[PDB]
Structures are given as structure tokens and as C-alpha cells.
Amino acid sequence: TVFRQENVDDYYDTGEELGSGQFAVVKKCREKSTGLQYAAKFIKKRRTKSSRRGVSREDIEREVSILKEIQHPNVITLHEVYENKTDVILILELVAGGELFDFLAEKESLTEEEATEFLKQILNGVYYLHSLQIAHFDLKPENIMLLDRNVPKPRIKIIDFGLAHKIDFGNEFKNIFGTPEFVAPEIVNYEPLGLEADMWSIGVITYILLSGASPFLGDTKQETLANVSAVNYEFEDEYFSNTSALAKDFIRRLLVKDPKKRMTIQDSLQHPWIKPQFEK
Numbered sequence: 692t693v694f695r696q697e698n699v700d701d702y703y704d705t706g707e708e709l710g711s712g713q714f715a716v717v718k719k720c721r722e723k724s725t726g727l728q729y730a731a732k733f734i735k736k737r738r739t740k741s742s743r744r745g746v747s748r749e750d751i752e753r754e755v756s757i758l759k760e761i762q763h764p765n766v767i768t769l770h771e772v773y774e775n776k777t778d779v780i781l782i783l784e785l786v787a788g789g790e791l792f793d794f795l796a797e798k799e800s801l802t803e804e805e806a807t808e809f810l811k812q813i814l815n816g817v818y819y820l821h822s823l824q825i826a827h828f829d830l831k832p833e834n835i836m837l838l839d840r841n842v843p844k845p846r847i848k849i850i851d852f853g854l855a856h857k858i859d860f861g862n863e864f865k866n867i868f869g870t871p872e873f874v875a876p877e878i879v880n881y882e883p884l885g886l887e888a889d890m891w892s893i894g895v896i897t898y899i900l901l902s903g904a905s906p907f908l909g910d911t912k913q914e915t916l917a918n919v920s921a922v923n924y925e926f927e928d929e930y931f932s933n934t935s936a937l938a939k940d941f942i943r944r945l946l947v948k949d950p951k952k953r954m955t956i957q958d959s960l961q962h963p964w965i966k967p968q969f970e971k
């Protein structure tokens with residue numbers, strides 16, 4: 692698929708940088724014809740077929756195809772796509788309140804209601820995606836952004852569909868591997884992956900929201916991955932003494948090694964607590 696090849700600078704002005712990763716950089720921008728503001732994500736293209744630098748066109752097209760399908764309050768909206776010889780540039784909805792990761796870091800520890808207020812929105816977004824048979828595969832606090840961080844109950848959007856895949860056969864078997872602290876055991880073990888992997892990631896996020904601590908984090912990436920595969924975590928009393936037994940139950944039912952036994956997104960919404968990769 693071909694994208695707009697006009698110079699993006701003829702249609703947008705850029706400003707502050709919003710995110711910077713291994714293969715992409717995001718800049719705030721403003722559309723000249725409307726004055727509306729967006730986030731421009733510049734994804735570096737691969738320059739030779741056999742290279743490891745940049746992102747393959749297949750991977751870029753997949754991300755764009757998924758973003759084009761989705762529209763929901765708890766997921767980012769794609770506005771348009773440009774490209775040139777070096778980059779594919781995604782003009783995405785601007786989410787101005789920053790990452791949930793930074794909100795958690797800057798703010799004192801959350802209450803159980805503050806945690807569930809964020810969590811219910813994440814679950815609604817993931818319910819939408821899974822209903823579409825879309826696995827995100829990179830859910831974590833850095834990939835959730837707040838619309839306005841200065842309200843009592845911030846609204847959020849899920850971002851970063853760089854690893855997302857359509858799961859039309861129940862599972863996929865491809866080169867898919869997220870951030871060590873959040874990946875499911877099936878990712879660590881290079882097994883076929885489905886929607887269940889996201890549910891594990893939600894369990895990790897929930898643990899962090901309630902405690903400020905990461906359940907499987909080791910001193911090295913290999914330790915973290917070994918802890919995940921062995922389901923080596925526990926609820927530390929120092930951090931969970933004020934947390935309800937029902938919150939711990941919710942987590943326990945997500946941090947399950949066998950993906951078939953793990954709660955699904957629909958199970959998570961009906962749960963009583965809610966219902967109303969290498970070192971170098």
C-alpha cells in the first residue's frame with residue numbers, strides 16, 4: 692500500500708518531541724489547513740531487504756492497517772499517513788496529558804478506586820480490540836496516555852500498535868516479543884500467541900497500579916523473563932496490606948501460565964472486583 696508522498700512539512704508544522712524509541716520518534720504537530728494539533732510518529736524504514744535496522748514495510752503496513760480499523764474512545768485515532776525514502780509518518784491523535792507511566796511516577800501511590808478507574812478504561816479499550824480479534828501485544832503504562840492529567844479521574848487512550856496483530860485463527864506464530872516485565876509466559880517461551888497474552892499484561896499493569904512495584908522484575912532482562920515463565924511473583928505485605936482480597940483475586944486469575952485457564956477480557960469485566968528482548 693502506498694502513502695502520501697508530498698513533503699509533510701508543506702502541510703504541518705512540528706514542535707515539541709513527545710516520545711523517542713528505537714525505531715520511531717514522535718513530534719507534536721499542527722495541521723496548517725485547520726489549526727488542529729496531532730502527534731506525528733516518524734517510523735524509520737528498513738534500507739535493504741536483509742537489514743535489522745529500521746522497520747520492515749510488512750510491519751509498518753500491519754500497524755497502519757490496524758490503526759485504520761479502530762475507532763473507540765479508549766484507543767488512539769489515525770488521521771493520515773505520509774512517507775518518503777527514509778520514514779513512514781503517521782499523523783495520530785494528540786493525547787496531551789502524557790504517559791500513565793509518568794503519572795504513576797510523579798504521583799504518590801494510588802488508591803484502589805483510582806486504580807480501578809484507570810483499569811476500567813483499559814479493559815473497555817481492550818474489549819473493543821479483542822472483539823475485533825486484535826491483539827495489542829505491548830500493553831504497559833508507557834503505552835497508555837492521559838487526555839488531561841489535571842482532573843480527578845483522568846481519561847486514557849491506548850497507544851503504540853507497533854506489535855499488534857489480527858488473530859483470525861485463534862493464535863499467531865511470528866516474531867513477536869514485547870517488554871520483559873509485561874510479556875506473558877507464552878511470549879517468553881516462543882509459543883503461539885493469541886488474545887490471552889494481553890490479559891496477562893493487564894494483570895501486571897494492575898499489580899503495578901495498586902502497589903507501585905513490578906511483580907516479575909529482576910536485575911537483568913534474563914532474570915525478568917525467567918521469573919515470568921516460572922510465574923515467580925508474590926503479593927508483598929509491605930505494599931499490599933491495604934489492598935482488598937478481591938483485587939488480589941483479580942490479579943491471580945490473570946497471572947496464570949496456561950493461557951486457556953487465564954481470564955478473558957469478558958471474564959475480567961464480569962469479575963466481582965470490576966462488575967458494577969536481549970541484553971548487550
Ligand SMILES: c1ccc2cnncc2c1
Pocket residue numbers: 709710717730732767783784785786787836850851
Ligand atoms: C503516540 C505516541 C506518543 C504520543 C504522544 N502524545 N500524543 C499521542 C501520541 C501518540
Ligand SMILES: [Cl-]
Pocket residue numbers: 704705706707719720721
Ligand atoms: Cl506544535
Ligand SMILES: [Cl-]
Pocket residue numbers: 711712713714715
Ligand atoms: Cl520504537
Ligand SMILES: [Cl-]
Pocket residue numbers: 732850851852
Ligand atoms: Cl503510537
Ligand SMILES: [Cl-]
Pocket residue numbers: 753
Ligand atoms: Cl500478518
